[PDB]
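lol ok so funny story. i was supposed to be doing the assay writeup but got distracted and ended up predicting the structure for this chain instead. priorities right. anyway since i did it might as well share w the group, maybe its usefull for someone
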Amino acid sequence: SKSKLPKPVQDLIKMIFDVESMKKAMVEYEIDLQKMPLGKLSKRQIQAAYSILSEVQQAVSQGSSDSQILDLSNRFYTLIPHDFGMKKPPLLNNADSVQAKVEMLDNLLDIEVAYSLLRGGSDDSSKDPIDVNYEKLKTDIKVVDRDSEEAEIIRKYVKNTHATTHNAYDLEVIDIFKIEREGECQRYKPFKQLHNRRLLWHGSRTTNFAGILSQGLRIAPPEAPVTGYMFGKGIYFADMVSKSANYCHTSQGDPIGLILLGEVALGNMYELKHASHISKLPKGKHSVKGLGKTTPDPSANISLDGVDVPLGTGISSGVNDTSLLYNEYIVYDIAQVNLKYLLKLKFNFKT
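and the output, tada:
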């Protein structure tokens, strides 16, 4: 049977469940697909690699020499087989190297979720595989009409918050989907009337979306080192579309990406200017706000279904001596997020 879902929804389902895209992410990470194919990836293997990556960063912080670092770095490559032929693998000594591996493991965890959905469950050739994969997401997905009110506001948010420092590309909104993850509205109930509820961006690689729609935005596992995240292990958002769009990791070889709009209950924000690898918030705080030098103009904030949308053009925030060019918002309880929209974007690279 043929799917009756709208063509943009079918194309969205096709992109997020693409096995060749999952394999392409694993080749980007120099993973040996003979020793670690897509089907042999498992949570316990990724969690054990996160634990070794914590032992690696623990020694870097404790001023250990390259002789001691070598043994811990080699251990990481044992757990996550990389394809280096008969050469020694790149030494994980610097912070930029260890940071990249924590981020690789974050993507691998979501890839394992997506592939587990495709491989678990049933096979029925009489149904359209698009319809079958759609149901695995347990998310109602509707197309938002271009000439509707919510679409005008969303397109204005995209139009106004593209940073001048991210000028290597411009964005075109292809499709706007209104999404409703089953059980999420009920989970959000304790926070639905909290103050400082804002509609914020969350960008991610396309290969992470089957996991985000099936399980919602999650916090990194306990094995993951708290130092591998600027503000510790939470759920990150931005008010500048391009800061979030950069996390799609699109390129001229793959210029289409996906970005989320989520209602986030920020409440009492813990304001910070530099990295703070916290395990828990201070008492009475509900989120972290990383203070950027630039913020969408606060006077241009508008309300969409009771939620504040900071869609104003970027202006100076008045914040001096901060590590951040733009704001970032972090929550440490998954129940503080209610996903609202999912956009498909075309990145027009100007380089």
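The CA atoms of residues 185 and 338 lie 7 Å apart. DSSP finds ten helices and 14 strands in the chain.
back to the writeup now i swear
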